[PDB]
Ligand binder design. Structure first.
Ligand SMILES: *C(=O)[C@H]([C@@H](C)O)[C@H]1CC(SCCNC=N)=C(C(=O)O)N1
Ligand SMILES: [K+]
Ligand SMILES: [K+]
Ligand SMILES: [K+]
Ligand SMILES: [K+]
Ligand SMILES: [K+]
Length: 263
């Protein structure tokens, strides 16, 4: 609904920065509403969903096991590793790492998982192979969050990310067991509460992944819908703002409040 575009452009104004937005019908793939849908924005942590999608594709192909245990050390820990920092002694399994990477947005977990698939080049090759010729991961945590103006490294476009999430959550790309596992990790959450979830009505479903990087970058990707089932995909990214995290979170929550109201 155009009233949501009023809020999205108001958010750009309030934040003094670019906001990218897209609302997609999950079943049909139809773009219902958009703003700067084909401009690039840093993915930040939202890439972790794509990463675990690739991991699950490997699991399906018999090239990985969710129960495989990965051992790491203090040497491996990067900034923001709330879960991995507690398991240095006995390690964590692949399943546990994706749960950490998605529900807590653990950065070290993402790096360990990236290593299992062959690094950024392989995640990018996975995306290209699934029809996403835009989204690219080029670096590891923490550098991938640099958000350098006009830099195409580690970026996606709202339309591309929305289309990719749709394929991951509904396409024959993954087995049903794997699709649901990805959805289960996205439904769980300990960090995106101030975002779309703060505007979600009781009874509604939401599977999401947020992100925050340098230079004011902030974003979220999500599949949500009434009556416990997802029916639309929403992608929101912003970069360039000097606003506080609370201010950026509120704008994303208000964009969510609008799209829900006009559903
Ligand atoms: C992803 O965008 C980053 C990166 C460090 O992996 C992480 C860190 C953060 S902000 C720290 C805690 N978040 C919220 N309480 C996020 C994030 O999305 O908020 N992901
Ligand atoms: K429209
Ligand atoms: K555009
Ligand atoms: K160790
Ligand atoms: K989540
Ligand atoms: K949210």
């Amino acid at each position: 609904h155009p009233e949501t575009l009023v809020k999205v452009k108001d958010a750009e104004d309030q934040l003094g920065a670019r906001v990218g937005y897209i609302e997609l019908d999950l079943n049909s793939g139809k773009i219902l509403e958009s703003f700067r849908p084909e401009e690039r924005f840093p993915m930040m942590s939202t890439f972790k969903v794509l990463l675990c999608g690739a991991v699950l594709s490997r699991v399906d192909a018999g090239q990985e096991q969710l129960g495989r245990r990965i051992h790491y050390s203090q040497n491996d820990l990067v900034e923001y590793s709330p879960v991995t920092e507690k398991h240095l002694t006995d390690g964590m399994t692949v399943r546990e790492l994706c749960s950490a990477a998605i529900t807590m947005s653990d950065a070290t977990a993402a790096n360990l998982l990236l290593t299992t698939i062959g690094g950024p080049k392989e995640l990018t090759a996975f995306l290209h192979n699934m029809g996403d010729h835009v989204t690219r991961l080029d670096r590891w945590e923490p550098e991938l969050n640099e958000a350098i103006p006009n830099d195409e490294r580690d970026t996606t476009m709202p339309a591309a990310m929305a289309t990719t999430l749709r394929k991951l959550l509904t396409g024959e790309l993954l087995t049903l067991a794997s699709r649901q596992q990805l959805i289960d990790w996205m439904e769980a959450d300990k960090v995106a509460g101030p975002l779309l979830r703060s505007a979600l009505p009781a009874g509604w479903f939401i599977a999401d992944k947020s992100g925050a990087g340098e230079r004011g970058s902030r974003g979220i990707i999500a599949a949500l819908g009434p009556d416990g089932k997802p029916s639309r995909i929403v992608v929101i990214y912003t970069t360039g703002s000097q606003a506080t995290m609370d201010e950026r979170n509120r704008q994303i929550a208000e964009i969510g409040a609008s799209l829900i109201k006009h559903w």
